[PDB]
Design a protein around this ligand. Sequence first.
Ligand code: BCL
Ligand code: BCL
Ligand SMILES: CC[C@H]1c2cc3[nH]c4c(c3C)C(=O)[C@H](C(=O)OC)c4c3nc(cc4[nH]c(cc(n2)[C@@H]1C)c(C(C)=O)c4C)[C@@H](C)[C@@H]3CCC(=O)OC/C=C(\C)CCC[C@H](C)CCC[C@H](C)CCCC(C)C
Ligand SMILES: CC[C@H]1c2cc3[nH]c4c(c3C)C(=O)[C@H](C(=O)OC)c4c3nc(cc4[nH]c(cc(n2)[C@@H]1C)c(C(C)=O)c4C)[C@@H](C)[C@@H]3CCC(=O)OC/C=C(\C)CCC[C@H](C)CCC[C@H](C)CCCC(C)C
Ligand SMILES: COC(C)(C)C(=O)C/C=C(\C)CC/C=C(\C)CC/C=C(\C)CCCC/C(C)=C/CCC(C)CC/C=C(\C)CCC=C(C)C
Ligand SMILES: COC(C)(C)C(=O)C/C=C(\C)CC/C=C(\C)CC/C=C(\C)CCCC/C(C)=C/CCC(C)CC/C=C(\C)CCC=C(C)C
Ligand SMILES: COC(C)(C)C(=O)C/C=C(\C)CC/C=C(\C)CC/C=C(\C)CCCC/C(C)=C/CCC(C)CC/C=C(\C)CCC=C(C)C
Ligand SMILES: COC(C)(C)C(=O)C/C=C(\C)CC/C=C(\C)CC/C=C(\C)CCCC/C(C)=C/CCC(C)CC/C=C(\C)CCC=C(C)C
Ligand SMILES: COC(C)(C)C(=O)C/C=C(\C)CC/C=C(\C)CC/C=C(\C)CCCC/C(C)=C/CCC(C)CC/C=C(\C)CCC=C(C)C
Ligand SMILES: COC(C)(C)C(=O)C/C=C(\C)CC/C=C(\C)CC/C=C(\C)CCCC/C(C)=C/CCC(C)CC/C=C(\C)CCC=C(C)C
Ligand SMILES: COC(C)(C)C(=O)C/C=C(\C)CC/C=C(\C)CC/C=C(\C)CCCC/C(C)=C/CC[C@H](C)CC/C=C(\C)CCC=C(C)C
Ligand SMILES: COC(C)(C)C(=O)C/C=C(\C)CC/C=C(\C)CC/C=C(\C)CCCC/C(C)=C\CCC(C)CC/C=C(\C)CCC=C(C)C
Ligand SMILES: [Fe+3]
Lengths: 273, 44, 44, 44, 44, 44, 44, 325, 255, 51, 51, 51, 51, 51
Amino acid sequence: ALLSFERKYRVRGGTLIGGDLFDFWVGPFYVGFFGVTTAFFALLGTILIFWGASQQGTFNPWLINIAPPDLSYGLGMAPLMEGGLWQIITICAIGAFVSWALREVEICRKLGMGYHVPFAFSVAIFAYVTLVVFRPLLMGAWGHGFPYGIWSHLDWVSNTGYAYLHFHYNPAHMLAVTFFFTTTLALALHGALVLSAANPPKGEEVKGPDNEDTFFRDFIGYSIGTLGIHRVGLLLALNAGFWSAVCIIISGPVWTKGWPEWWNWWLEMPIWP
Amino acid sequence: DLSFTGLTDEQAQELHSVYMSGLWLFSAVAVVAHLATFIWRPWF
Amino acid sequence: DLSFTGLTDEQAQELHSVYMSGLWLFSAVAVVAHLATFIWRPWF
Amino acid sequence: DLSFTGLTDEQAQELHSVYMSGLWLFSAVAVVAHLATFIWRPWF
Amino acid sequence: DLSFTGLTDEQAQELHSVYMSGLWLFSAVAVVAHLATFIWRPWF
Amino acid sequence: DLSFTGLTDEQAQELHSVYMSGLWLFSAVAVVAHLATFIWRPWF
Amino acid sequence: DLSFTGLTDEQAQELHSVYMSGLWLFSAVAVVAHLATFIWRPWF
Amino acid sequence: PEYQNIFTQVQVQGPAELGVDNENNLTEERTTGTGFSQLIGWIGNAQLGPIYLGWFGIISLVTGTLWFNIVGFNMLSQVGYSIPEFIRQLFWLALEPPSPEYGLRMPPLDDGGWFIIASFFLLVSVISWWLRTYQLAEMHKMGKHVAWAFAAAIWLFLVLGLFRPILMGSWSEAVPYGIFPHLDWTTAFSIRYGNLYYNPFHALSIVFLYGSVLLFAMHGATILAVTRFGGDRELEQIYDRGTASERAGLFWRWTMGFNATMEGIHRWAWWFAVLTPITGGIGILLTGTVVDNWFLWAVEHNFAPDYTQDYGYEAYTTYDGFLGR
Amino acid sequence: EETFFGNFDLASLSLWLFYGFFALLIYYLQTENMREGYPLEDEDGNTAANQGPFPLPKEKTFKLQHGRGELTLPGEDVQRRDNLALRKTAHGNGFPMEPTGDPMLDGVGPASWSKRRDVPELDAHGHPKIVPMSAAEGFGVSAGTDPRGLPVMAGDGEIVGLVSDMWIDEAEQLVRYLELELDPEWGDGKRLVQRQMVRIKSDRVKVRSIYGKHFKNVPKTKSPNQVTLLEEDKIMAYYAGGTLYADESRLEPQL
Amino acid sequence: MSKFYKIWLIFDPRRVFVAQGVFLFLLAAMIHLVLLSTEHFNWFELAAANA
Amino acid sequence: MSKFYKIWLIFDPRRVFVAQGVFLFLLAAMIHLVLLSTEHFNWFELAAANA
Amino acid sequence: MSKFYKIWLIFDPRRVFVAQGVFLFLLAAMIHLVLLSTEHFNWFELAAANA
Amino acid sequence: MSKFYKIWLIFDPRRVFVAQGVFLFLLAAMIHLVLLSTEHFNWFELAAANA
Amino acid sequence: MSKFYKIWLIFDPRRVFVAQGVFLFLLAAMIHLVLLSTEHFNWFELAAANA
Ligand code: BCL
Ligand code: BCL
Ligand SMILES: CC[C@H]1c2cc3[nH]c4c(c3C)C(=O)[C@H](C(=O)OC)c4c3nc(cc4[nH]c(cc(n2)[C@@H]1C)c(C(C)=O)c4C)[C@@H](C)[C@@H]3CCC(=O)OC/C=C(\C)CCC[C@H](C)CCC[C@H](C)CCCC(C)C
Ligand SMILES: CC[C@H]1c2cc3[nH]c4c(c3C)C(=O)[C@H](C(=O)OC)c4c3nc(cc4[nH]c(cc(n2)[C@@H]1C)c(C(C)=O)c4C)[C@@H](C)[C@@H]3CCC(=O)OC/C=C(\C)CCC[C@H](C)CCC[C@H](C)CCCC(C)C
Ligand SMILES: COC(C)(C)C(=O)C/C=C(\C)CC/C=C(\C)CC/C=C(\C)CCCC/C(C)=C/CCC(C)CC/C=C(\C)CCC=C(C)C
Ligand SMILES: COC(C)(C)C(=O)C/C=C(\C)CC/C=C(\C)CC/C=C(\C)CCCC/C(C)=C/CCC(C)CC/C=C(\C)CCC=C(C)C
Ligand SMILES: COC(C)(C)C(=O)C/C=C(\C)CC/C=C(\C)CC/C=C(\C)CCCC/C(C)=C/CCC(C)CC/C=C(\C)CCC=C(C)C
Ligand SMILES: COC(C)(C)C(=O)C/C=C(\C)CC/C=C(\C)CC/C=C(\C)CCCC/C(C)=C/CCC(C)CC/C=C(\C)CCC=C(C)C
Ligand SMILES: COC(C)(C)C(=O)C/C=C(\C)CC/C=C(\C)CC/C=C(\C)CCCC/C(C)=C/CCC(C)CC/C=C(\C)CCC=C(C)C
Ligand SMILES: COC(C)(C)C(=O)C/C=C(\C)CC/C=C(\C)CC/C=C(\C)CCCC/C(C)=C/CCC(C)CC/C=C(\C)CCC=C(C)C
Ligand SMILES: COC(C)(C)C(=O)C/C=C(\C)CC/C=C(\C)CC/C=C(\C)CCCC/C(C)=C/CC[C@H](C)CC/C=C(\C)CCC=C(C)C
Ligand SMILES: COC(C)(C)C(=O)C/C=C(\C)CC/C=C(\C)CC/C=C(\C)CCCC/C(C)=C\CCC(C)CC/C=C(\C)CCC=C(C)C
Ligand SMILES: [Fe+3]
């Protein structure tokens, strides 16, 4: 089933690899080389998770937990029932995420658009890879990654935060939190302004961009425009992701003491009496 | 005759012959390698 | 006659014949492998 | 005559015959498997 | 007459008759299963 | 007359008749079930 | 005349006359409920 | 490569836009005077000003300035009026809520009176600002979506500072006014009542915050990628559909199996953002008044994980082995 | 605090109420997004037998400015194209379509346009929104590099003409289009390019999407002072179709 | 008194009915639960500690 | 009471039927669950103890 | 009861059939799982104990 | 019933076949995995113990 | 059973073949990996211990 305007866009071509060996649709979904790889990796990972759950002893979604190996194994391969399953599932997840991004690139190419969406997804992929690959590699053990469980991956965050004592004193954490809050506020304001323009009180005509510009200059004295708001939102979200990755990567391999101690450079500058 | 790729029957036969030849050569090399490895360090 | 794909009766019969020829060979190979594995290490 | 899918009465009968044959074959295989398993390890 | 879906009366009558046949067969199988279960392990 | 849904009086009367029949059947089954339960384990 | 809903005086009269019967019946059921509850377990 | 439309290639400047008007006569209260900034013109509009001056805006400005000055002068007096030491310890100072022994009574100025006065002024300022944002939309003949989304954040603000201390019966339950001192309050609040992770409404709030950031990333990238078809003019695309909207919908339909409209994406965005403070406030209001230990609650409701291995370093290594001796 | 039954306290009741509310909200949000493009069809143009899990919404009405009337949605697809030069490559569903003639000239594929109104977009005063710079009072270049007079470079590396003017958006103070004057060897008349497909350098302007021989077939405007919505859709679709149809190597797999 | 029919000239009959249906169900549920919370009027536990 | 059929001149039956079905099933499930949290009316435990 | 067939003049059969198909399987799975959570009606543990 | 063949006048066979294949495979995998979570019916562990 | 060839009048082989190819390799990898996580059937460890 197609939308009323969809048929004229479903043309052949625009693939990075494969040609027309995989150039078709299944329902609404587009299939390609990277669709095939995505299906393989995602299905294998999910089935392996459920096999590990059956061998653990519980099928409760809240209670399933698949964990990385002990620190004494270093960077080698562990027995499959003591941490190897986590490593295999990690490999599957990385493959699946990269395949998803490349499939998005192929769809963008076929539709004649820019490649902003795959680029934006790459930052989330980068944060995940920093969490599970780069930090354990620098720290020297695969056992530093977080476990795969709905409620057990919060205990990891808690214990990792309290291992540097007071984690709110991390400056990069401060920057990331600020970016998150500002992104949410901007999204609320943008949605509200567009809806208010398009949906006036009953019996009234609709409004235009001049009206929106006037509301915000009256409200706060400045208006960013209908093109600047999208740039600003994208930049804020990407900065949030990037600084989250930086804040986690500096906690283990670069700083070892508690985070309040870091501000001693400010507290003891020579310029003070 | 049914064809989605535009090839004919004769062309498909001729291509399949060479493809089978390559497959058999690959398999023979792999068999020799597996025999040597088993002699060196046997599983099973 | 009902045909969502555009094929005729004879084309479907030919395709099914070749497909089942492939299926039976796959199954025979798997049966031989399973018998050898059971002789090596039984699971019943 | 009511038809959402565009099929006809005779086409639906012809399709249903083959569908039911496949269902019965699947069920027969499942019954034999369940009987072998019950003889191996009873659950009642 | 009033009809939100587009069917007539005869089509609705036929559809409901077949639906009722299916419901009765389902219920009969469920009843047999419940009776066997009660004989095996009685509640109440 | 007043109508927000687009029906006429006769259609509403017929619909209400069928709805009341369904409601009474549901209520009768529930009453029999409640009587059996009270005999099995009385409350009050 | 003032009418913020668009209905006429007679329509409102009939609607209220129908609504009051349902209100009275709902109240009547509640009296029989509260009369049996008191006998079972008084609260005064 | 192709132009990516992040910074404008060339800028143009004309007469300043003073704004639209109607019978409500908005021009009467507007300031005269505008400026142009070429540095911010690379990313958005360059014009600065003018602004609207009403009663609500002036009241809000005065009360907020008073709150700021009260906090600042208390912090300055707490250090001996020494300016270099005031600068040295700026991030560590605060104006502190009253002691628990005073209940809801008025405390002395030394032990929370100034805190109460500052809180009253801040509350007046915020409510006046909300009134101004409502009145402007009423006078522009537009919808009231901005006011309703500001009211959703004001709900969590009020729950944190007013409603919960009244329900618990003590003004000592509020938040201190300081930078490092309010991050100390956050951590201590989490520790005092078990683990705030196991509060299901905190988890729902996190769900909605993560989702709103994800949605803004998606929407910004998508609109920037169809700008070559004039996609940034969203209102005209709502009134008269074009190929930008069709391509934007078909991308996500072919990606994940369903899509939105040009007008319907903003409804999704509006709800995901507003649902964050609402669930957060519901979660905060239930803590201490209903539930006192969230981990024990999770144990009772059977969603706390269980661990089999042992605790302590001597089950994994040796003190000499760690030191390398 | 006490429990009504078992472990049921106020928190559990609040949680279940939120679950119900969220289900209703999800239904509402999904339904509000089905006002364009429904009902669904198959690849032959007929109504599909499957229509989904969610029923269609009720109708809403807009009131447009400058006396354009009303818009009620959902309704009939008034932006639909009539004769498409496309062909099917399979007897069933789920396979691509193949262009019949020239996809760039026929407006199919990534070269597709939608049938918008044949009138210009207006500002709050009721005037055309996009105007050539030669007829805008008090406007001028304030930063960046002025592109007027610089030569234009094609995607294959050919010089086709010079930039003669810019068309700006007066209400939002932004440049929308670049106007070119074609050399006699590469066509006649003037053409427009959207600002989002060009790169302005110190000595030239570069357009990479289409080649030198494609510049004479760019759709033209009817008037030298304004452009309608249809014309804009047709012009921008033409420029975007070249990212796939300008060269045979842009369509075949890259590997 | 007998002029109470005029209420339907101000309020729309549909939404008032919906609101009364919801409010009445919630009221009945709350009253049944508040009675269950006590000890003299709990019928499950009274039936348990009777036989 | 003879004029109760006019409710279908106000409410659309298509929405009413769906709402009623959801409400009836949820109510029945909730009552059955409440019965299973007691000790005098839990038929599974009653069967276990009886044997 | 003889006019119950008119429900198909109100509800679309395709959506109803899909919804019922999902509902019946979910209900059956829930009931089997509820049985497995008891001590008296768990047939795997019974099979283990009887052997 | 001899009129059951009319289900194909309402549902498209192409979509029903795909849904049935997915459902059947997932159900089989679920059952096979439920068996392996017990001690009495885990055939790998029984094989290990019998040696 | 003799009319099973008519499935190719419903489904195009081009989609079916890729679906089957993905499914079979997924199954093989899953089964080999499941065997490799036991003690009795892990052939790599059996070879090491036997020496
Ligand atoms: C004691 C606990 C410490 C603490 C410990 C930590 C630690 C430790 C960490 C942070 C991290 C974060 N902290 Mg902190 N933090 C604390 C208190 C707070 C508070 C607060 C008090 O209000 C806030 C607002 C935050 C918030 C934050 C963010 C700045 C950051 C979250 C990462 C992120 O969003 O990356 C988002 C990116 C991702 C990882 C998402 C990846 C997505 C992938 C690519 C896609 C998956 C697809 C999926 C499988 C598909 C499924 C759907 C299909 C249908 C199947 N912290 C306390 C004080 N904080 C985390 C961080 O920054 O790590 C990077 C972190 O590790
Ligand atoms: C050790 C720390 C505890 C913890 C303690 C808390 C506490 C305590 C709280 C949060 C709360 C929140 N937590 Mg938590 N939280 C922890 C760890 C985390 C982690 C993580 C580890 O990844 C994350 C991502 C979060 C995330 C969150 C947010 C989802 C949520 C805040 C809601 C919001 O919208 O804020 C946005 C903030 C606001 C809208 C506040 C109101 C702002 C008003 C409108 C400002 C008015 C204007 C001003 C006065 C004038 C300025 C003047 C100008 C110059 C003009 N928490 C750990 C477990 N969390 C809050 C919540 O809701 O909990 C349920 C909360 O109270
Ligand atoms: C993040 C959103 C917050 C916000 C921010 C904000 N306020 C702003 C701006 C912004 C982004 C301006 O651009 C505008 C301004 O001119 O800032 C310098 C302004 C402003 N709106 C204000 C009021 C105001 N808005 C408020 C609200 C808010 N606006 C939000 C809380 C509040 C509060 C917190 O209650 C107040 C008090 C002042 C802060 C300032 C006053 C501007 C004005 O009166 O008219 C417009 C400007 C002119 C008179 C002409 C230029 C002179 C400028 C005041 C200085 C800069 C000129 C310089 C040549 C350019 C340098 C670049 C600038 C960006 C700094
Ligand atoms: C949906 C929830 C999200 C949200 C929404 C939200 N916030 C909002 C709104 C909305 C919809 C507004 O409409 C409103 C607004 O004005 O936005 C521009 C606002 C707002 N959200 C704000 C803050 C804020 N929101 C936050 C969070 C959030 N806001 C959530 C993520 C947070 C945090 C902690 O995350 C903060 C800190 C303000 C910027 C603004 C409310 C402004 C207000 O109420 O001001 C009252 C006035 C005063 C107290 C006067 C202060 C006096 C100053 C000392 C000087 C004068 C002001 C001057 C301009 C500043 C100094 C400038 C220097 C250059 C001198
Ligand atoms: C142990 O457990 C784990 C999971 C770890 C595993 O390891 C599991 C592993 C598996 C389950 C593995 C499964 C592996 C397979 C199914 C492998 C299959 C491999 C093949 C079918 C290989 C085929 C190779 C064929 C080749 C090489 C053919 C031809 C090569 C040529 C060079 C021929 C050239 C042809 C020409 C020139 C034709 C030109 C003709 C004209 C007319 C132009
Ligand atoms: C034990 O518990 C766990 C969960 C761990 C399990 O392991 C559970 C496992 C299962 C539940 C497993 C279930 C497995 C199945 C249902 C498997 C089914 C397998 C098949 C149906 C396999 C079919 C294979 C068919 C093949 C190979 C057919 C043909 C192959 C060909 C190469 C034929 C090629 C045909 C041509 C060229 C036709 C061309 C003809 C023309 C005329 C053009
Ligand atoms: C104990 O406490 C707890 C909570 C744990 C519980 O377990 C509580 C449980 C409940 C309260 C459960 C309640 C359960 C129900 C109310 C269940 C109701 C079930 C039904 C009404 C089922 C009906 C099924 C009907 C069927 C299958 C009928 C027919 C199907 C077909 C006929 C298929 C064929 C259709 C065709 C051919 C269409 C014909 C088309 C034409 C054009 C003629
Ligand atoms: C804990 O204990 C405490 C005391 C704290 C409490 O719990 C406090 C409780 C209270 C304070 C409770 C208060 C309760 C009330 C005030 C209750 C009031 C109830 C009513 C007014 C009920 C009215 C019901 C009316 C009904 C049922 C009428 C009609 C129903 C119909 C279905 C029929 C209507 C049909 C129509 C109109 C057809 C339309 C006709 C046309 C011609 C179009
Ligand atoms: C949605 O909006 C609109 C406008 C449509 C409405 O408002 C709609 C409203 C409705 C559709 C409302 C519907 C309401 C009902 C269906 C209500 C039904 C109420 C009952 C059936 C109540 C029954 C109550 C019974 C009680 C309380 C019984 C108590 C019994 C005892 C305490 C036992 C005491 C023992 C005795 C009497 C011994 C008996 C001995 C004998 C010899 C007989
Ligand atoms: C003890 O305390 C606690 C809180 C624990 C409780 O448990 C409290 C419980 C309550 C407060 C419970 C309250 C319960 C109610 C008020 C229940 C009310 C129930 C009903 C009103 C039920 C109505 C059922 C009606 C039915 C089943 C009707 C069926 C109709 C049909 C099948 C016919 C359909 C109609 C057609 C086809 C129209 C014909 C079509 C044409 C086109 C002519
Ligand atoms: C124990 O508790 C738990 C929860 C753990 C459980 O395990 C609970 C489990 C359940 C509740 C399970 C319930 C399971 C079911 C209800 C299963 C039902 C299964 C079926 C009805 C399966 C039917 C399969 C039918 C098939 C495969 C039939 C035929 C297929 C074909 C014939 C293919 C060929 C088709 C052709 C050629 C048609 C073309 C014809 C033309 C004329 C063109
Ligand atoms: C002296 O030097 C000068 C003059 C330059 C200064 O003025 C310098 C000033 C400073 C350096 C100031 C610095 C100020 C800060 C760092 C302030 C930080 C403030 C916060 C982080 C504040 C958080 C506040 C509130 C929070 C977290 C939540 C909720 C609060 C409220 C709802 C408050 C509302 C209170 C009410 C309603 C109680 C009122 C009581 C009544 C009885 C009406
Ligand atoms: Fe937008």
